[PDB]
Protein backbone atom coordinates (compact mmCIF):
# COMPACT_ATOMS: atom_id res chain seq x y z
CA UNK A 1 0.00 0.00 0.00
CA UNK A 2 2.84 2.38 0.93
CA UNK A 3 4.97 1.28 -2.05
CA UNK A 4 1.91 1.27 -4.34
CA UNK A 5 1.03 4.92 -3.60
CA UNK A 6 4.59 5.90 -4.55
CA UNK A 7 4.43 3.77 -7.72
CA UNK A 8 1.03 5.10 -8.83
CA UNK A 9 2.35 8.65 -8.38
CA UNK A 10 5.33 7.82 -10.61
CA UNK A 11 3.14 6.37 -13.36
CA UNK A 12 0.77 9.37 -13.38
CA UNK A 13 3.76 11.73 -13.67
CA UNK A 14 5.21 9.63 -16.51
CA UNK A 15 1.86 9.87 -18.33
CA UNK A 16 2.00 13.67 -18.16
CA UNK A 17 5.59 13.52 -19.44
CA UNK A 18 4.64 11.50 -22.53
CA UNK A 19 1.63 13.76 -23.18
CA UNK A 20 3.81 16.89 -23.20
CA UNK A 21 6.25 15.13 -25.53
CA UNK A 22 3.38 14.35 -27.93
CA UNK A 23 2.05 17.92 -27.63
CA UNK A 24 5.51 19.30 -28.44
CA UNK A 25 6.16 16.85 -31.29
CA UNK A 26 2.89 17.96 -32.90
CA UNK A 27 4.27 21.51 -33.15
CA UNK A 28 7.34 20.10 -34.93
CA UNK A 29 5.03 18.29 -37.37
CA UNK A 30 3.17 21.55 -38.07
CA UNK A 31 6.53 23.23 -38.74
CA UNK A 32 7.64 20.49 -41.16
CA UNK A 33 4.34 20.78 -43.05
CA UNK A 34 4.89 24.56 -43.15
CA UNK A 35 8.31 24.05 -44.78
CA UNK A 36 6.94 21.65 -47.39
CA UNK A 37 4.08 24.03 -48.29
CA UNK A 38 6.65 26.84 -48.55
CA UNK A 39 8.71 24.87 -51.08
CA UNK A 40 5.54 23.76 -52.91
CA UNK A 41 4.78 27.41 -53.73
CA UNK A 42 8.10 27.73 -55.59
CA UNK A 43 8.40 24.54 -57.68
CA UNK A 44 12.43 31.34 -42.93
CA UNK A 45 15.18 32.22 -40.42
CA UNK A 46 12.65 32.10 -37.56
CA UNK A 47 11.74 28.58 -38.72
CA UNK A 48 15.26 27.35 -37.85
CA UNK A 49 14.99 28.88 -34.37
CA UNK A 50 11.48 27.47 -33.78
CA UNK A 51 12.61 23.98 -34.85
CA UNK A 52 15.52 24.29 -32.41
CA UNK A 53 13.21 25.59 -29.66
CA UNK A 54 10.81 22.62 -29.65
CA UNK A 55 13.63 20.06 -30.00
CA UNK A 56 15.08 21.36 -26.71
CA UNK A 57 11.69 20.86 -25.01
CA UNK A 58 11.25 17.34 -26.43
CA UNK A 59 14.71 16.01 -25.50
CA UNK A 60 14.44 17.54 -22.01
CA UNK A 61 11.14 15.65 -21.66
CA UNK A 62 12.62 12.43 -23.06
CA UNK A 63 15.54 12.69 -20.61
CA UNK A 64 13.08 13.19 -17.73
CA UNK A 65 10.86 10.37 -19.04
CA UNK A 66 13.87 8.02 -19.19
CA UNK A 67 14.72 8.87 -15.57
CA UNK A 68 11.09 8.45 -14.48
CA UNK A 69 10.77 5.15 -16.37
CA UNK A 70 13.75 3.73 -14.48
CA UNK A 71 12.33 4.90 -11.12
CA UNK A 72 9.06 3.08 -11.85
CA UNK A 73 10.81 -0.14 -12.94
CA UNK A 74 12.93 -0.24 -9.76
CA UNK A 75 9.94 0.34 -7.47
CA UNK A 76 7.93 -2.36 -9.25
CA UNK A 77 10.76 -4.83 -8.59
CA UNK A 78 10.75 -3.68 -4.96
CA UNK A 79 6.96 -4.07 -4.73
CA UNK A 80 7.22 -7.59 -6.19
CA UNK A 81 10.00 -8.37 -3.69
CA UNK A 82 7.88 -7.36 -0.67
CA UNK A 83 4.82 -9.21 -2.02
CA UNK A 84 6.48 -12.63 -2.39
Amino acid sequence: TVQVRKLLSGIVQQQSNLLRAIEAQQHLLKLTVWGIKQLQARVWLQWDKEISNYTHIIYELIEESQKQQEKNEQELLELDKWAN
Partner: antibody
Framework: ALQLVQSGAEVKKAGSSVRVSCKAS????????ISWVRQAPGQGPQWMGG????????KYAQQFQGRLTITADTSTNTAYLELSSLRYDDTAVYYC???????????????????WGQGTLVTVSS | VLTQPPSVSGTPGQRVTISCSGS????????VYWYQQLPGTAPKLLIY???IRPSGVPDRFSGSKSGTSASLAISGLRSEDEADYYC????????????FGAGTKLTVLG
Protein backbone atom coordinates in the same frame (compact mmCIF):
# COMPACT_ATOMS: atom_id res chain seq x y z
CA ALA B 1 17.51 6.68 -11.19
CA LEU B 2 20.35 4.63 -12.71
CA GLN B 3 23.76 4.90 -11.06
CA LEU B 4 27.00 3.07 -11.84
CA VAL B 5 29.25 1.59 -9.14
CA GLN B 6 32.72 0.44 -10.22
CA SER B 7 35.14 -1.91 -8.45
CA GLY B 8 38.65 -3.31 -8.88
CA ALA B 9 41.45 -0.75 -8.70
CA GLU B 10 44.57 -2.89 -9.09
CA VAL B 11 48.14 -2.83 -10.43
CA LYS B 12 49.36 -5.34 -13.03
CA LYS B 13 52.65 -6.18 -14.77
CA ALA B 14 53.12 -5.84 -18.55
CA GLY B 15 51.36 -8.66 -20.41
CA SER B 16 48.69 -9.48 -17.82
CA SER B 17 44.89 -9.76 -17.73
CA VAL B 18 42.76 -7.22 -15.83
CA ARG B 19 39.04 -7.59 -15.11
CA VAL B 20 37.03 -4.46 -14.24
CA SER B 21 33.31 -4.59 -13.37
CA CYS B 22 30.56 -2.00 -13.90
CA LYS B 23 27.64 -2.78 -11.57
CA ALA B 24 24.35 -0.90 -11.88
CA SER B 25 22.34 0.42 -8.93
CA UNK B 26 18.94 2.13 -8.85
CA UNK B 27 17.77 0.75 -12.21
CA UNK B 28 18.24 -1.89 -14.92
CA UNK B 29 20.14 -1.18 -18.14
CA UNK B 30 17.65 -3.14 -20.23
CA UNK B 31 17.04 -1.08 -23.38
CA UNK B 32 20.37 0.75 -23.10
CA UNK B 33 24.01 0.17 -24.07
CA ILE B 34 26.98 0.63 -21.72
CA SER B 35 30.29 1.75 -23.26
CA TRP B 36 33.83 1.82 -21.85
CA VAL B 37 36.02 4.94 -22.02
CA ARG B 38 39.53 5.37 -20.59
CA GLN B 39 41.46 8.52 -19.63
CA ALA B 40 45.24 8.69 -19.21
CA PRO B 41 46.49 10.92 -16.34
CA GLY B 42 46.97 14.41 -17.79
CA GLN B 43 45.59 13.42 -21.20
CA GLY B 44 41.94 13.42 -22.33
CA PRO B 45 39.37 10.58 -22.59
CA GLN B 46 39.34 7.90 -25.30
CA TRP B 47 36.54 5.52 -26.34
CA MET B 48 37.38 1.85 -25.68
CA GLY B 49 34.36 -0.19 -26.77
CA GLY B 50 30.63 -0.84 -26.32
CA UNK B 51 28.06 -3.60 -25.76
CA UNK B 52 24.28 -4.06 -25.85
CA UNK B 53 23.39 -6.33 -22.87
CA UNK B 54 19.85 -7.14 -24.06
CA UNK B 55 21.09 -8.17 -27.53
CA UNK B 56 24.71 -9.27 -27.08
CA UNK B 57 26.08 -6.93 -29.76
CA UNK B 58 29.65 -5.63 -29.43
CA LYS B 59 31.76 -2.85 -30.95
CA TYR B 60 35.50 -2.24 -30.52
CA ALA B 61 37.96 0.51 -31.45
CA GLN B 62 40.65 -0.32 -34.03
CA GLN B 63 43.42 0.23 -31.45
CA PHE B 64 42.05 -2.45 -29.09
CA GLN B 65 40.47 -4.95 -31.52
CA GLY B 66 41.58 -8.47 -30.60
CA ARG B 67 43.07 -7.82 -27.16
CA LEU B 68 39.93 -6.19 -25.75
CA THR B 69 36.85 -8.24 -24.84
CA ILE B 70 33.80 -6.86 -23.01
CA THR B 71 30.73 -8.80 -21.82
CA ALA B 72 27.55 -7.93 -19.91
CA ASP B 73 25.54 -10.20 -17.61
CA THR B 74 21.82 -9.34 -17.43
CA SER B 75 20.90 -11.64 -14.51
CA THR B 76 23.13 -9.70 -12.08
CA ASN B 77 23.22 -6.44 -14.08
CA THR B 78 27.00 -6.20 -14.39
CA ALA B 79 29.24 -5.23 -17.32
CA TYR B 80 32.84 -6.47 -17.47
CA LEU B 81 36.07 -5.19 -19.04
CA GLU B 82 38.99 -7.48 -19.94
CA LEU B 83 42.37 -6.64 -21.48
CA SER B 84 44.85 -9.26 -22.69
CA SER B 85 48.50 -8.42 -23.52
CA LEU B 86 48.94 -5.37 -21.29
CA ARG B 87 51.19 -2.51 -22.44
CA TYR B 88 52.86 0.31 -20.44
CA ASP B 89 50.73 3.07 -22.02
CA ASP B 90 47.50 1.41 -20.77
CA THR B 91 47.99 3.14 -17.38
CA ALA B 92 44.71 5.07 -17.21
CA VAL B 93 41.46 5.68 -15.32
CA TYR B 94 38.76 3.45 -16.80
CA TYR B 95 35.12 4.57 -16.93
CA CYS B 96 31.82 2.91 -17.86
CA UNK B 97 28.88 4.93 -19.21
CA UNK B 98 25.63 4.28 -21.12
CA UNK B 99 24.43 5.98 -24.30
CA UNK B 100 20.88 7.30 -23.87
CA UNK B 101 19.85 6.28 -27.39
CA UNK B 102 17.76 3.09 -27.26
CA UNK B 103 16.91 2.94 -30.98
CA UNK B 104 19.85 1.72 -33.12
CA UNK B 105 22.48 1.54 -30.39
CA UNK B 106 25.83 2.16 -32.10
CA UNK B 107 26.92 4.57 -34.85
CA UNK B 108 23.41 6.07 -35.10
CA UNK B 109 24.40 9.78 -34.82
CA UNK B 110 24.33 9.44 -31.01
CA UNK B 111 26.96 9.40 -28.26
CA UNK B 112 24.80 10.62 -25.39
CA UNK B 113 26.52 9.42 -22.21
CA UNK B 114 24.79 10.61 -19.02
CA UNK B 115 25.43 8.35 -16.00
CA TRP B 116 29.14 7.67 -15.52
CA GLY B 117 30.86 5.15 -13.25
CA GLN B 118 33.02 6.31 -10.34
CA GLY B 119 36.18 5.12 -12.13
CA THR B 120 38.89 2.56 -11.44
CA LEU B 121 42.66 3.11 -11.27
CA VAL B 122 44.43 0.60 -13.51
CA THR B 123 48.20 0.96 -13.17
CA VAL B 124 50.66 -0.75 -15.53
CA SER B 125 54.11 -0.93 -13.91
CA SER B 126 56.47 -3.81 -13.12
CA VAL C 1 41.67 14.54 -32.91
CA LEU C 2 39.49 17.46 -31.72
CA THR C 3 41.55 20.59 -31.03
CA GLN C 4 41.07 22.47 -27.74
CA PRO C 5 42.92 25.47 -26.25
CA PRO C 6 45.03 24.53 -23.17
CA SER C 7 43.56 27.12 -20.77
CA VAL C 8 41.15 30.07 -20.69
CA SER C 9 40.94 32.43 -17.71
CA GLY C 10 38.16 34.71 -16.43
CA THR C 11 37.45 36.88 -13.38
CA PRO C 12 34.29 36.06 -11.34
CA GLY C 13 31.25 37.11 -13.40
CA GLN C 14 32.78 37.07 -16.89
CA ARG C 15 31.60 35.01 -19.86
CA VAL C 16 34.15 32.44 -21.04
CA THR C 17 34.17 30.79 -24.48
CA ILE C 18 35.87 27.42 -25.04
CA SER C 19 36.58 26.64 -28.70
CA CYS C 20 36.72 23.15 -30.24
CA SER C 21 38.22 22.82 -33.73
CA GLY C 22 37.32 19.69 -35.70
CA SER C 23 37.12 18.08 -39.14
CA UNK C 24 34.25 17.82 -41.64
CA UNK C 25 33.99 14.12 -40.80
CA UNK C 26 33.23 14.61 -37.08
CA UNK C 27 31.89 18.09 -36.21
CA UNK C 28 30.69 19.40 -39.59
CA UNK C 29 28.23 16.51 -39.96
CA UNK C 30 27.38 15.23 -36.47
CA UNK C 31 26.41 16.36 -32.95
CA VAL C 32 28.79 17.97 -30.44
CA TYR C 33 28.85 16.90 -26.78
CA TRP C 34 30.49 18.71 -23.85
CA TYR C 35 31.64 17.31 -20.50
CA GLN C 36 32.65 18.87 -17.18
CA GLN C 37 35.21 17.11 -15.00
CA LEU C 38 35.85 18.36 -11.47
CA PRO C 39 39.21 17.04 -10.16
CA GLY C 40 38.77 13.53 -8.73
CA THR C 41 35.24 13.08 -10.09
CA ALA C 42 34.00 11.41 -13.29
CA PRO C 43 33.29 13.53 -16.41
CA LYS C 44 29.66 14.68 -16.11
CA LEU C 45 27.60 15.62 -19.18
CA LEU C 46 27.30 19.40 -19.54
CA ILE C 47 25.88 19.95 -23.06
CA TYR C 48 24.45 17.26 -25.35
CA UNK C 49 23.22 17.00 -28.97
CA UNK C 50 24.27 20.52 -30.07
CA UNK C 51 23.14 23.01 -27.38
CA ILE C 52 20.59 20.84 -25.50
CA ARG C 53 21.06 20.84 -21.72
CA PRO C 54 20.65 18.02 -19.13
CA SER C 55 18.57 18.43 -15.95
CA GLY C 56 20.51 20.24 -13.22
CA VAL C 57 22.96 22.13 -15.43
CA PRO C 58 22.42 25.93 -15.00
CA ASP C 59 21.14 28.17 -17.83
CA ARG C 60 24.47 30.07 -17.79
CA PHE C 61 26.10 27.21 -19.73
CA SER C 62 25.42 27.35 -23.47
CA GLY C 63 26.78 25.27 -26.35
CA SER C 64 27.01 26.55 -29.93
CA LYS C 65 28.16 25.22 -33.31
CA SER C 66 28.99 26.83 -36.67
CA GLY C 67 30.51 24.73 -39.46
CA THR C 68 33.38 22.45 -38.44
CA SER C 69 34.08 24.31 -35.18
CA ALA C 70 32.02 24.31 -31.97
CA SER C 71 32.14 26.54 -28.88
CA LEU C 72 31.00 26.34 -25.24
CA ALA C 73 29.98 29.58 -23.53
CA ILE C 74 30.08 29.88 -19.73
CA SER C 75 28.47 33.12 -18.53
CA GLY C 76 28.69 34.38 -14.94
CA LEU C 77 31.69 32.42 -13.69
CA ARG C 78 31.74 31.00 -10.16
CA SER C 79 34.22 29.05 -7.99
CA GLU C 80 32.23 25.87 -8.76
CA ASP C 81 33.12 26.06 -12.47
CA GLU C 82 36.89 25.63 -12.03
CA ALA C 83 37.24 22.30 -13.88
CA ASP C 84 38.41 20.48 -17.03
CA TYR C 85 36.12 20.63 -20.08
CA TYR C 86 36.06 18.19 -23.01
CA CYS C 87 34.27 18.38 -26.38
CA UNK C 88 33.13 15.17 -28.09
CA UNK C 89 31.66 14.07 -31.43
CA UNK C 90 30.85 10.91 -33.40
CA UNK C 91 33.37 10.44 -36.22
CA UNK C 92 32.86 8.70 -39.57
CA UNK C 93 36.63 8.50 -40.15
CA UNK C 94 38.55 5.20 -39.90
CA UNK C 95 40.05 6.48 -36.63
CA UNK C 96 37.02 5.14 -34.75
CA UNK C 97 33.59 6.24 -33.45
CA UNK C 98 33.26 8.79 -30.61
CA UNK C 99 36.21 11.21 -30.67
CA PHE C 100 37.07 13.37 -27.65
CA GLY C 101 39.03 16.62 -27.38
CA ALA C 102 42.28 17.21 -25.49
CA GLY C 103 40.71 19.35 -22.75
CA THR C 104 40.54 22.93 -21.51
CA LYS C 105 41.44 24.05 -17.99
CA LEU C 106 39.13 26.81 -16.73
CA THR C 107 40.40 29.07 -13.94
CA VAL C 108 38.30 31.39 -11.74
CA LEU C 109 41.53 33.35 -11.16
CA GLY C 110 41.68 34.82 -7.64
Amino acid sequence: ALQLVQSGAEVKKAGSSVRVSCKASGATFSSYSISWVRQAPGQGPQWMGGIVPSSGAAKYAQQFQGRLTITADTSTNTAYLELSSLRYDDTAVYYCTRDRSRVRYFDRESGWFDPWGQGTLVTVSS
Amino acid sequence: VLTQPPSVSGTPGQRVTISCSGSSSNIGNNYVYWYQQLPGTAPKLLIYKNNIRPSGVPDRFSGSKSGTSASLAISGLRSEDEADYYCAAWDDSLSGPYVFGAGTKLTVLG
